[PDB]
Amino acid sequence: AGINYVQNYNGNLGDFTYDESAGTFSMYWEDGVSSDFVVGLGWTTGSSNAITYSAEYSASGSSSYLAVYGWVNYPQAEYYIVEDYGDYNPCSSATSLGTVYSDGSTYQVCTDTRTNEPSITGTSTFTQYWSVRESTRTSGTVTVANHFNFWAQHGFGNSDFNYQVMAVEAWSGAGSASVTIS
């Protein structure tokens, strides 16, 4: 793996353990949360290399995602490749970009603009790009390049990356995750 970055945004709202050299982390929020956390492991600089993972992920009562997650510095953008999620599909609500096919499934692709929200430079306005897997799963390989190349047709900068992680996010409800990045 060569993990060199630990993602912890409000991880203290649940129980987050990890081991960088093994590439594994777990996150338990059995009691529920009513604020946003994002936790995971990855790299201080993103790239388009494939990521392979294996997880147990249980969040059907939760507004949550199991995702490849990271940022582009300029133009400022937050992105997700959502492999499995709970009760909330971010593309229901957002502007549709079409469909991409990759690694065994179609993904719905969409984008949204977030204004004055927490970001890698503090509080700012940025674009989000989402690929949401049509057949959800909790293990496999994400050929990141196929998503980046599609989003790049729609303004994604596709270079000048900040961090990139395999992550679990939840902001409501309860569940449980355990993830290995190989």
Experimental method: X-ray
Residue 124 near residue 70 (C-beta atoms within 8 A): no
Verify whether residue 78 is a known catalytic residue. yes
Residue with the two structure tokens 């990890």: 18
Verify whether residue 169 is a known catalytic residue. yes
Instruction: Determine the Cα angle at 125 with ends 122 and 126, to 5°.
Output: 100
Catalytic residue among 30, 78, 117, 134: 78
Q: β-strand 122-133 against 77-85: which pairing, if any?
A: parallel
In which domain, by residue range, is 180 found?
1-182
Burial grade of 125 (CB within 10 A; 0-12, 13-18, 19 or more): exposed
Residue 27 near residue 168 (C-beta atoms within 8 A): yes
Q: What is the resolution of the experimental data for this entry, in Å?
A: 2.0
The CATH number assigned to the domain holding 45 equals: 2.60.120.180
Give dist(CA 179, CA 96) in Å, integer.
29
**Residue 98: both structure tokens together:** 């079409």
As for how many domains the chain has, the answer is 1
Give the residue among 3, 48, 45, 75 at the shortest CA–CA distance from 161.
45
